[PDB]
Design an enzyme around this catalytic site. Structure first.
Site, mmCIF file in Angstrom:
data_model
loop_
_atom_site.group_PDB
_atom_site.id
_atom_site.type_symbol
_atom_site.label_atom_id
_atom_site.label_comp_id
_atom_site.label_asym_id
_atom_site.label_seq_id
_atom_site.Cartn_x
_atom_site.Cartn_y
_atom_site.Cartn_z
ATOM 1 N N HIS B 506 -40.582 -69.743 -59.897
ATOM 2 C CA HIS B 506 -40.283 -69.270 -58.503
ATOM 3 C C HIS B 506 -39.040 -69.915 -57.955
ATOM 4 O O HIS B 506 -38.892 -70.023 -56.724
ATOM 5 C CB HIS B 506 -41.521 -69.519 -57.600
ATOM 6 C CG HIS B 506 -42.655 -68.534 -57.882
ATOM 7 N ND1 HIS B 506 -43.867 -68.657 -57.281
ATOM 8 C CD2 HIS B 506 -42.748 -67.436 -58.752
ATOM 9 C CE1 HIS B 506 -44.683 -67.627 -57.677
ATOM 10 N NE2 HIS B 506 -43.998 -66.836 -58.531
ATOM 11 N N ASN B 551 -45.129 -65.636 -53.703
ATOM 12 C CA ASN B 551 -44.350 -65.140 -54.856
ATOM 13 C C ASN B 551 -43.132 -64.387 -54.342
ATOM 14 O O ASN B 551 -43.222 -63.543 -53.490
ATOM 15 C CB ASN B 551 -45.127 -64.173 -55.785
ATOM 16 C CG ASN B 551 -46.641 -64.475 -55.847
ATOM 17 O OD1 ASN B 551 -47.319 -64.409 -54.800
ATOM 18 N ND2 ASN B 551 -47.164 -64.833 -57.026
HETATM 19 C C1 LIG Z 1 -42.710 -64.927 -66.612
HETATM 20 C C2 LIG Z 1 -43.498 -64.729 -65.297
HETATM 21 C C3 LIG Z 1 -42.872 -64.381 -64.097
HETATM 22 C C4 LIG Z 1 -43.553 -63.946 -62.966
HETATM 23 C C5 LIG Z 1 -44.915 -63.978 -63.003
HETATM 24 C C6 LIG Z 1 -45.588 -64.474 -64.113
HETATM 25 C C7 LIG Z 1 -44.899 -65.016 -65.226
HETATM 26 C C8 LIG Z 1 -45.689 -65.624 -66.363
HETATM 27 N N1 LIG Z 1 -45.616 -63.405 -61.971
HETATM 28 C C9 LIG Z 1 -44.929 -63.017 -60.859
HETATM 29 C C10 LIG Z 1 -43.620 -63.313 -60.671
HETATM 30 N N2 LIG Z 1 -42.996 -62.964 -59.560
HETATM 31 C C11 LIG Z 1 -43.623 -62.443 -58.492
HETATM 32 O O1 LIG Z 1 -43.066 -62.258 -57.394
HETATM 33 N N3 LIG Z 1 -44.964 -62.227 -58.624
HETATM 34 C C12 LIG Z 1 -45.731 -62.536 -59.683
HETATM 35 O O2 LIG Z 1 -46.954 -62.231 -59.767
HETATM 36 N N4 LIG Z 1 -42.879 -63.669 -61.784
HETATM 37 C C13 LIG Z 1 -41.455 -63.826 -61.526
HETATM 38 C C14 LIG Z 1 -40.773 -62.501 -61.670
HETATM 39 O O3 LIG Z 1 -40.987 -61.917 -62.909
HETATM 40 C C15 LIG Z 1 -39.224 -62.633 -61.374
HETATM 41 O O4 LIG Z 1 -39.063 -63.226 -60.038
HETATM 42 C C16 LIG Z 1 -38.447 -61.337 -61.418
HETATM 43 O O5 LIG Z 1 -38.595 -60.659 -62.654
HETATM 44 C C17 LIG Z 1 -36.998 -61.663 -61.130
HETATM 45 O O6 LIG Z 1 -36.286 -60.455 -61.267
HETATM 46 P P1 LIG Z 1 -34.723 -60.291 -61.607
HETATM 47 O O7 LIG Z 1 -33.917 -61.091 -60.602
HETATM 48 O O8 LIG Z 1 -34.369 -58.856 -61.933
HETATM 49 O O9 LIG Z 1 -34.599 -61.305 -62.852
HETATM 50 P P2 LIG Z 1 -35.242 -61.217 -64.403
HETATM 51 O O10 LIG Z 1 -35.169 -62.623 -64.928
HETATM 52 O O11 LIG Z 1 -36.561 -60.459 -64.459
HETATM 53 O O12 LIG Z 1 -34.279 -60.225 -65.193
HETATM 54 C C18 LIG Z 1 -32.841 -60.643 -65.345
HETATM 55 C C19 LIG Z 1 -32.352 -59.915 -66.637
HETATM 56 O O13 LIG Z 1 -30.992 -60.387 -66.870
HETATM 57 C C20 LIG Z 1 -30.804 -60.467 -68.260
HETATM 58 N N5 LIG Z 1 -29.646 -61.313 -68.464
HETATM 59 C C21 LIG Z 1 -29.673 -62.656 -68.295
HETATM 60 N N6 LIG Z 1 -28.514 -63.269 -68.490
HETATM 61 C C22 LIG Z 1 -27.635 -62.300 -68.844
HETATM 62 C C23 LIG Z 1 -26.258 -62.132 -69.094
HETATM 63 N N7 LIG Z 1 -25.445 -63.129 -69.135
HETATM 64 N N8 LIG Z 1 -25.800 -60.918 -69.473
HETATM 65 C C24 LIG Z 1 -26.562 -59.795 -69.439
HETATM 66 N N9 LIG Z 1 -27.886 -59.821 -69.094
HETATM 67 C C25 LIG Z 1 -28.399 -61.060 -68.836
HETATM 68 C C26 LIG Z 1 -32.117 -60.934 -68.856
HETATM 69 O O14 LIG Z 1 -32.119 -60.564 -70.212
HETATM 70 C C27 LIG Z 1 -33.029 -60.212 -67.940
HETATM 71 O O15 LIG Z 1 -33.688 -59.118 -68.522
HETATM 72 O O1 LIG Z 2 -47.937 -69.747 -63.968
HETATM 73 C C1 LIG Z 2 -48.597 -68.554 -63.521
HETATM 74 C C2 LIG Z 2 -47.998 -68.152 -62.207
HETATM 75 O O2 LIG Z 2 -46.666 -67.594 -62.484
HETATM 76 C C3 LIG Z 2 -45.923 -67.185 -61.358
HETATM 77 O O3 LIG Z 2 -44.663 -66.848 -61.753
HETATM 78 C C4 LIG Z 2 -46.689 -66.026 -60.713
HETATM 79 O O4 LIG Z 2 -45.999 -65.533 -59.591
HETATM 80 C C5 LIG Z 2 -48.064 -66.411 -60.350
HETATM 81 F F1 LIG Z 2 -48.708 -65.202 -59.951
HETATM 82 C C6 LIG Z 2 -48.814 -66.971 -61.496
HETATM 83 O O5 LIG Z 2 -49.080 -65.990 -62.546
#
Ligand SMILES: *Cc1cc2c(cc1C)Nc1c([nH]c(=O)[nH]c1=O)N2C[C@H](O)[C@H](O)[C@H](O)COP(=O)(O)OP(=O)(O)OC[C@H]1O[C@@H](n2cnc3c(N)ncnc32)[C@H](O)[C@@H]1O
Ligand SMILES: OC[C@H]1O[C@@H](O)[C@H](O)[C@@H](F)[C@H]1O
Ligand SMILES: *Cc1cc2c(cc1C)Nc1c([nH]c(=O)[nH]c1=O)N2C[C@H](O)[C@H](O)[C@H](O)COP(=O)(O)OP(=O)(O)OC[C@H]1O[C@@H](n2cnc3c(N)ncnc32)[C@H](O)[C@@H]1O
Ligand SMILES: *Cc1cc2c(cc1C)Nc1c([nH]c(=O)[nH]c1=O)N2C[C@H](O)[C@H](O)[C@H](O)COP(=O)(O)OP(=O)(O)OC[C@H]1O[C@@H](n2cnc3c(N)ncnc32)[C@H](O)[C@@H]1O
Ligand SMILES: OC[C@H]1O[C@@H](O)[C@H](O)[C@@H](F)[C@H]1O
Lengths: 576, 576, 90, 90
Positions: B506, B551
């Protein structure tokens, strides 16, 4: 979805894809069903390791393997937890919990055995080792003519190798691979020969290998399509195949009963030819659910109507493992041809060699890579470049050492990956024993307990046979200890051990092949046709009736190719 | 691939997909790059838990998560291994092994921080919890008018909820859910409110939930296509985006430098508008690699030329965790409305209830499921159906309990999954604290050490701030211990504990938003536009500048929606 | 030499461990990052718990220990008393 | 002197222990010395080691000893899980 196909194939692993490649190519109208789903990307059934990220972070791929290995039979759990709070609900007995199988004797299990339900099957995660069996491991296809039998095996294996893209050259420029290969070759001095593990793979670049899979055998795209306008193929994922329906006389299969897991709908599919390539466990399950062999706990006082040998004479390999930390002598040897002057990190430091010197221990490419590593990374105390590929070394099974060997780095790690010892120093050792087929070693299916797909629960009754199998297994352990010591001492936390029975996933003989159903105690003939049935074939490692130590998939593929030959000689494709 | 687009988006997570949805829909010619690959099924960027097999084997999903969480910064290892063989190569120092980061103080780290590189980003494995932030956790979008601020946030959150398919009634007929919910509602009557966790998901059947992901927001299919014949979108997987090229005047971005990981070729891509959604770590990395902020170990004596607050004021939440085993009292309450007679396992057994009875403690849906479980599984000692879904319970952040809560069962298990206690008894507890933004808490990038993609190595300098952060974290711990005790005692092996810093994923404030660059110590304005630059926008949790416990993804999506409103007013699409 | 120890021989290891005091223990560098934010938290790996900051952990005899009781180590030893052959002997 | 928790799964009548001990060449660089600042629990100069097993014969024999134990012990039985072949702490 049609009601009627020429051929239906149960399972989309590499053996069902062998059938698809042969039969779709020969113009048959083919349907394939898999209980699992498409989840390798846009190349359907492809290797999940073929991402840039996984090959840059190869310590992570164990998670992918673990994610899709569902334990076949878990005995009821009897761990004592006596530190619950007194307010918490507590059991008075060790009751049937968490999907456990009350049929299973915990002490006669293959606890390691597990199944994969995904398009491509296990070939979405496998190691891609594809050795041939030598005669001593291999079943007979021609009796009383060994040259005819050798010729037939060589033709089939050659084809199977083309399908998988098997080679022995993908690791030829790794320093670690050659360090270990050359030392073993020298040490054995002709008593044993070493080579690269034959791998189903093509190298794309110095940092990336395109690992083969089902996808490489057959791309699994529906046909007709622009690339294949005269071919007919449909794949149906998320479809559980449950039963083949027998005619009264037990001479033909009349339909395949399926369950679509997304809709819940059920159907009877009609084909001319029925092919079961659901894996060694699930082929057996589907057949028992269809009134072959015996449902329930074995009862010899009620002999089965059909296939009395189904689920008996099962074989699994013994597997011994360790890791080693490269010797000081071997690491110093990497730099044997170098002249090193000054102190690393100072502008007066240099590392040089004499190109093409007769007396150099290593080739110019090796010395070039060592030089560039040592000069560009003077902080690093090792001479091995950072992204040097792993070793992939074997001495194949022989009568004097009747086990297969894989020496290098395997993606399927067994404990926490240690980070204290540099990865460049670590070599894994896996030695795989052959197991005598014995009638008492069984896979059977409960008449009451069901699995997560409401199918009869698989149950093992297995022990490694006394006699040869056990003597060899312990001798193999000793051989690993003796061999591996020529490279380095054991890594703490990866000491020499036997792995859980069936962890190695080389189960054979559950629906075994032979020439005569009674005399050879078998279920299919050398066309992989189920005895008595005109139009029912089985593919896979459950076919193999021998004791083998080498990795079985290539051998199963070869049997599948031969089965196809029989199909082509006995069934006519429908007009397009 | 063309050389020129209207809009380039870096990253295909849910936030890049929000930009894609708005701007592709508004007629822009859009390209999106991701460093990772399409690996998830034919629905590109979709949730990996949406397979039949994972929802039948939900304990296996933790492997998927682990498989694609690559640690950000791993300090040099100092474990002592003094049981190597004397022949093994043995270190004289704790040198830089295994891709470790020698910049990192192990005692000022976020050791649990990790990144995901796959199409769809972390939304291919997330929990899908999408609560709104209340004023106390939320940055201002309107100054000096709290009501208009609230109105703007409601407008944006409502859209964002629509995009993700957020809802609060997917678990409403779970016995376990209601058992926990009702008990906590009663225990905290007039003191705290409990509800379902708001979840981005649609229930498809009593045993299957379609979890949302990036794919829900935007399907990631190339356009034009039959369904969108006037839209223009291309997704380019396996492309590492390395630098935005600043003009000399530092007013405009002129190109995006990319590396095709399959060919190995490099390209410069031109767009009108550059959007960085690479996550809170990798947006920061790309900007510092492009001359924003300060490269290397922070040095206040050389102020950076651009974005001096980039990588400062970072926040991560404190996380406490335990599991409980349901109390005897609660379990016996599940069957309070049943009339039971006869002998379990015999034809005399009967379990019945009176629908509608005013003396019933539970609704008819609940009693019907209990009765059907007890009748169909008469050997089983619990009244809870086997496939009853997990709880999904929260009491949202309030001033008197300034932490987010999630009570139920999370797929991200932290230890080996115990098998001795029935899973229907287990309830997980996770409480998330808010962290004050402090200039000294930093994410910075090495000027020498590089990561696996040859980019500057991220390094953390982080501790939870003394004062309110720390007090509330410990108070949060105690609140978990007090509340969970109302449901059951702790499960051995899952005792109350703080999780590794950053394991919760987070992270915020690494390129934080505010109204004025200097006065609010920030990087982007409320349009998410980089100060000073006409055509550079950032999306993600790195924008969030406040201390938040809930979250963050819904909040980031809200801000990206607002950003696209500016884009649409200030740039015109090219002719189709 | 107690009836109780020779009836419960698996317990004697506790006797041995109870009177083996490590000779030189290097400074500990294990990372504990799951303390509560209210707990007193180290900024360095300082000299704790009787550890020896002179000692290189990588050039130690970490198992070396000493026994301070009347009779010395002969109050717990295995009692194996072979002779050295010439090759081992001064 | 058992080195880990005593297992209770396998009958103790089946268990045989194997300990082999190698000889170490005397080398001037291998030292026991005493701090001039750090003191022990009795206020005496703190012992410090600077030790490695010498290269050459001591190391070669040490590893050939390990191999010898793996070869010999196999004649009696296979290894007990949890007590696999290992070097003990120096
Ligand atoms: C792993 C995880 C994360 C979340 C939860 C649980 C677990 C185990 N649960 C969750 C979360 N968030 C919530 O609000 N509620 C929940 O219940 N998790 C966090 C959530 O998953 C993230 O906050 C969210 O995806 C963030 O979104 P985003 O800002 O679009 O960022 P991502 O990391 O998903 O995707 C970025 C994307 O960029 C690519 N990338 C990275 N670096 C580069 C460069 N240099 N070039 C090109 N592309 C790049 C990555 O490959 C990625 O796919
Ligand atoms: O470590 C597990 C936790 O991971 C965060 O990224 C999620 O937002 C929570 F819902 C919980 O699944
Ligand atoms: C998991 C694993 C497996 C192997 C290696 C490493 C690892 C960790 N390494 C490897 C192996 N084999 C070798 O020869 N060399 C190696 O280096 N592995 C074993 C290999 O992976 C298998 O032998 C091979 O895939 C077997 O092929 P198959 O006979 O085609 O079987 P699969 O299990 O792959 O596919 C069966 C397919 O059937 C579906 N299924 C199951 N039940 C049904 C029902 N009732 N209806 C419909 N479909 C069903 C499955 O979902 C599966 O996809
Ligand atoms: C602990 C142990 C030791 C041995 C075996 C097993 C185990 C777990 N088994 C064994 C041994 N040796 C063999 O030859 N065969 C075996 O089967 N062990 C080693 C043996 O136990 C020692 O080599 C032997 O006792 C050494 O005899 P020592 O030279 O008389 O020395 P000790 O350490 O026994 O006693 C010294 C003594 O002096 C006291 N002391 C120490 N410092 C001071 C100071 N400054 N002032 C006064 N007194 C001091 C100690 O308290 C101790 O009692
Ligand atoms: O446990 C790991 C082993 O699994 C077998 O199935 C493979 O054939 C071996 F190559 C090896 O990877």
């Amino acid at each position: 979805m049609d009601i009627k196909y020429d051929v239906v194939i149960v399972g989309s692993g590499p053996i069902g894809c062998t059938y698809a490649r042969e039969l779709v190519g020969a113009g048959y109208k083919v349907a394939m069903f898999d209980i699992g789903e498409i989840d390798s990307g846009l190349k359907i059934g492809a290797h999940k390791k073929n991402t840039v990220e996984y090959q840059k972070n190869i310590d992570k791929f164990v998670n992918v393997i673990q994610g899709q290995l569902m334990s076949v039979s878990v005995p009821v759990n009897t761990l004592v937890v006596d530190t619950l709070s007194p307010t918490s609900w507590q059991a008075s007995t060790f009751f049937v919990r968490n999907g456990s199988n009350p049929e299973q004797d915990p002490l006669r299990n293959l606890s390691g055995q597990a199944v994969t339900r995904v398009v491509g099957g296990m070939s979405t995660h496998w190691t891609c080792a594809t050795p041939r069996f030598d005669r001593e491991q291999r079943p007979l296809l021609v009796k009383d003519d060994a040259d005819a039998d050798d010729a037939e095996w060589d033709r089939l294996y050659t084809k199977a190798e083309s399908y998988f893209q098997t080679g022995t050259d993908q690791f030829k420029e790794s320093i670690r691979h050659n360090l270990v290969l050359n030392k073993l070759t020298e040490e054995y001095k002709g008593q044993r020969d070493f080579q690269q593990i034959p791998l189903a793979a093509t190298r794309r670049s110095p940092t990336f290998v395109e690992w083969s899979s089902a996808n490489t055998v057959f791309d699994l795209q529906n046909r007709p399509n622009t690339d294949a306008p005269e071919e007919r193929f449909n794949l149906f994922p998320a479809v559980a195949c449950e039963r083949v329906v027998r005619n009264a006389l037990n001479s033909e299969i009349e339909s395949l009963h399926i369950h679509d897991l997304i809709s819940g709908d059920r159907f009877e599919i009609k084909a001319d030819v029925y092919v079961l390539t659901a894996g060694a466990v699930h082929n057996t399950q589907l057949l028992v659910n269809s009134g072959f062999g015996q449902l329930g706990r074995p009862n010899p006082a009620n002999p089965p109507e059909l296939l009395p040998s189904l689920g008996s004479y099962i074989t699994e390999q013994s597997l011994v493992f360790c890791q080693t930390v490269m010797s000081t002598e071997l690491i110093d040897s990497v730099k044997s041809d170098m002249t090193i002057r000054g102190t690393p990190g100072e502008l007066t430091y240099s590392v040089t060699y004499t190109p093409g010197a007769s007396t150099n221990k290593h080739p110019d490419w090796w010395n070039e890579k060592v030089k560039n590593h040592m000069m560009q990374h003077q902080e690093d105390p090792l001479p091995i470049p950072f992204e040097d590929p792993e070793p992939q070394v074997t001495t194949l099974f022989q009568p004097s050492h009747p086990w297969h060997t894989q020496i290098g780095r395997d993606a399927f790690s067994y404990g926490a990956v240690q980070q204290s010892i540099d990865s460049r120093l670590i070599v894994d050792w896996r030695f795989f024993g052959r197991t005598e087929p014995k009638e008492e070693n069984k896979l059977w299916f409960s008449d009451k307990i069901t699995d997560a797909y409401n199918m009869p629960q698989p149950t093992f009754d297995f022990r490694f046979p006394a006699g040869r199998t056990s003597k060899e297994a312990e001798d193999m352990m000793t051989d690993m200890c003796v061999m591996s010591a020529k490279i380095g001492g054991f890594l703490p936390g990866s000491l020499p051990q036997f792995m859980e029975p069936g962890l190695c996933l080389h189960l054979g003989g559950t629906h075994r092949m032979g020439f005569d159903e009674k005399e050879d105690n078998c279920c299919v003939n050398t066309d992989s046709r189920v005895f008595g049935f005109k139009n029912l074939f089985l593919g896979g490692c459950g076919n193999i009736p021998t004791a083998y130590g080498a990795n079985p998939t290539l051998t199963a593929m070869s049997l599948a190719i031969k089965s196809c030959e029989y199909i082509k000689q006995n069934f006519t494709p429908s007009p397009f």
